[PDB]
Design a protein around this ligand. Structure first.
Ligand SMILES: N[C@H](C(=O)N1CCCC1)C1CCN(c2nccc3c(-c4ncc(Cl)cc4Cl)cccc23)CC1
Ligand SMILES: [Ca+2]
Ligand SMILES: [Ca+2]
Ligand SMILES: [Ca+2]
Ligand SMILES: [Ca+2]
Length: 650
């Protein structure tokens, strides 16, 4: 009893009204009084509480009292009920009107009430059970103390017959599909029927009609069928009312991720409608509302435990396959192989989670859906066609959880390679950046990757965990680290060491030849400035100190556009399987039958408990022109931190 509703008595006639629990009536008795009438008394039934209110002061009135009050516009009734009517109910309020003369009433106005309970319930407290009429169910708030029901995008595929994800249609073919959906229960209590002229309607806005699907299970105790009642091209649905205590169970699916202009919030309504007449719209005399937040797409940083490694390459790349298999066998992970870097630049494994359910979701941006991917509890979302090389999951990274100036990012931050504002350089397309920002929970940061020919952040940075700790390291490519090492080996008398040994397609490149190349030195000094510009952003935006950064030797060649391409394989772009790192084999100068780049990287990483395996992904091609033709992608366990416990900035 909190919402006040105006119900007036009608001159002489009797008014019959449905009373919805959780509301109360203010009732005008003065306008219905006959002319000249001076006082009024009233009767009412047991389950109707009635107060006379005389200038804001309310008085509780007995059921069968003979008390009279002076008729005044400022004297009214407040009518409240707390139990729903049954078939044996006669819930009424009766007003008698007296003139100044006698004590026998001169007219009588009546209010006849049918009390029903209506409540559209969702799991706004996020425990996977639909509580009864959560008071905050019509709002959605972030944080551990926040509330509001969560909805998944139903983008997996329960049956392989149809080609697209489940939410692409308005059908449910398998009852296993319901496990992905959020439950919404219409709870009602009342008599066998609604009084004449009323109906209960579920509805959504046209805008939300491509955001949700709402289904009902028919004949659950035999051959089950699932009816689409709200969503695409279905804005409302007249509910069949059942008397007594009734619950109608609905299943809600999300159809759309948060994006530019869609915040993730969707509303479903139930209204009790009153039939006024033909040609008049039905009046909504009571409306209950629930809100859902569609769960965002979340990316998984390298610090999360690996579940399975996805590998794409050619069928005769035996060295690569063997070493990746050896690497994965040091771990508990599964290996999945597909027979150039599309598995790393075109595909990205993220996940979605609600309190009741969650599963991995892969986004695909072609430059056909990978068959070894979409399926049960594996979501697959493809980009809508119609970009530069910066539009690539290679130009996207996600950091480990970080705290920055007291502001925590419990799911890390997405990093996007870009150019300088006034540069006129390349930039990831606005649709991609807007989509990532719209997910909110991994507050993206733009880096500087347009100094690279390909333009991907994974060409110069990565994160590894520190084994046995909750800490991580940022790995940065470093040309200065490479020149320091080479000048050292040259001073040590190894200037004639040859690079790219074991690659017959490659030039007689030595350390001496590299150090004597003045043009190459200037180029890599400039590229170090580009790396250091990114270093400063990462430290600022991720809360890093110099103690959290390892510089791995790298070397670049400048092209006509003044952009860098790897001189030898970029070791920073590695497979991170907890303590086990699969590092691209550099093919550096060999000092004592051992690559001096390999031994240097081992000296940097192994003291930290990291185990280095160098993977050869180029020997099958016989030469390196800056391109990796093999890809890998790791599906990781989701964060234990639930995204809805976060508090993003406004
Ligand atoms: N309506 C869709 C939706 O929610 N569903 C459709 C099927 C069921 C659920 C949305 C999916 C996301 N859509 C994208 N918007 C920006 C980007 C995208 C990328 C991408 N491509 C490249 C990079 Cl580097 C980064 C990214 Cl995120 C891949 C893939 C889709 C994308 C916007 C439409
Ligand atoms: Ca609940
Ligand atoms: Ca479907
Ligand atoms: Ca599904
Ligand atoms: Ca599923």
């Amino acid at each position: 009893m909190l919402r006040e509703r105006t119900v007036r008595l009608q001159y002489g006639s009797r008014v019959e009204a449905v009373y919805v629990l959780g509301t109360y009536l203010w009732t005008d008795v003065y306008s219905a009084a006959p002319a000249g009438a001076q006082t009024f008394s009233l009767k009412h039934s047991e389950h109707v509480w009635v107060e006379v209110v005389r200038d804001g002061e309310a008085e509780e009135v007995a059921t069968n009292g003979k008390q009279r009050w002076l008729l005044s516009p400022s004297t009214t009734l407040r009518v409240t009920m707390s139990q729903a009517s049954t078939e044996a109910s006669s819930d009424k309020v009766t007003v008698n009107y007296y003139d100044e003369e006698g004590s026998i009433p001169i007219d009588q106005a009546g209010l006849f009430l049918t009390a029903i309970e209506i409540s559209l319930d969702v799991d706004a407290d996020r425990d996977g059970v639909v509580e009864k009429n959560n008071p905050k169910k019509a709002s959605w708030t972030w944080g551990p103390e926040g509330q509001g029901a969560i909805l998944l995008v139903n983008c997996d595929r329960e049956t392989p017959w149809l080609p697209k994800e489940d939410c692409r249609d308005e059908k449910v073919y398998s009852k296993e599909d319901l496990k992905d959906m959020s439950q919404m229960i219409l709870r009602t209590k009342g008599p066998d029927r609604l009084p004449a002229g009323y109906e209960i309607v579920l509805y959504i806005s046209m805008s939300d009609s491509d955001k949700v699907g709402v289904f009902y299970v028919e004949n659950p105790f035999f051959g089950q069928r699932y009816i689409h009642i709200l969503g695409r091209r279905k804005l409302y649905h007249v509910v069949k009312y059942t008397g007594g205590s009734a619950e109608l169970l609905f299943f809600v699916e999300g159809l759309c991720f948060p994006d530019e202009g869609f915040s993730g919030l969707v509303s479903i309504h139930v209204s009790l409608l009153e039939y006024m007449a033909q040609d008049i719209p039905l009046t909504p005399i009571f409306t209950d509302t629930v809100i859902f937040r569609i769960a965002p797409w979340i990316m998984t940083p390298n610090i999360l435990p690996p579940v399975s490694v996805f590998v794409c390459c050619m069928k005769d790349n035996y060295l690569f396959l063997k070493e990746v298999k050896n690497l994965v066998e040091k771990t508990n992970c599964e290996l999945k192989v597909c027979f150039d870097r599309w598995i790393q630049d075109e595909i990205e494994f993220g996940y979605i989670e609600a309190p009741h359910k969650g599963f991995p979701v892969v986004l695909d941006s072609p430059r056909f859906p990978v068959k070894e991917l979409l399926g049960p509890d594996f979501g697959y979302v493809t980009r809508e066609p119609l970009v530069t090389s910066l539009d690539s999951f290679g130009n996207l990274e996600v950091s480990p959880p970080v705290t920055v100036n007291g502001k925590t990012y419990p799911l890390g931050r997405i990093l996007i390679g870009s150019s300088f504002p006034l540069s006129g350089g390349r930039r990831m397309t606005k649709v991609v950046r807007d989509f990532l920002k719209a997910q909110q929970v991994q507050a993206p940061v733009e880096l500087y990757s347009d100094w690279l020919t390909v333009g991907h952040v994974d060409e110069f940075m990565s994160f590894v965990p520190i084994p046995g700790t909750k800490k991580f390291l940022l790995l940065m490519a470093s040309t200065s680290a490479c020149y320091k090492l080479f000048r050292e080996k040259q001073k040590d008398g190894h200037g004639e060491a040859i690079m790219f040994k074991g690659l017959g397609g490659m030039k007689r490149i030595t350390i001496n030849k590299i150090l004597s190349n003045e043009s190459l030195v200037q180029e890599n000094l400039y590229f170090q400035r580009c790396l250091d510009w990114n270093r400063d952003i990462l430290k600022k935006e991720l809360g890093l100190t110099e103690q959290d950064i390892i510089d791995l030797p790298a070397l670049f060649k400048m092209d006509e556009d003044h952009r860098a391409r790897a001189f030898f394989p970029n070791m920073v772009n590695m497979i991170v399987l907890d303590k086990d790192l699969g590092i691209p084999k550099p093919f550096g100068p060999q000092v004592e039958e051992e690559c001096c780049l390999e031994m240097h990287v081992r000296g940097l990483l192994e003291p930290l408990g990291l185990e280095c395996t160098f993977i050869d992904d180029i020997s099958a091609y016989h030469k390196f022109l800056g391109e990796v033709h093999c890809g890998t992608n790791v599906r990781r366990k989701p964060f234990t931190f639930k995204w809805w416990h976060m508090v993003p900035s406004r």
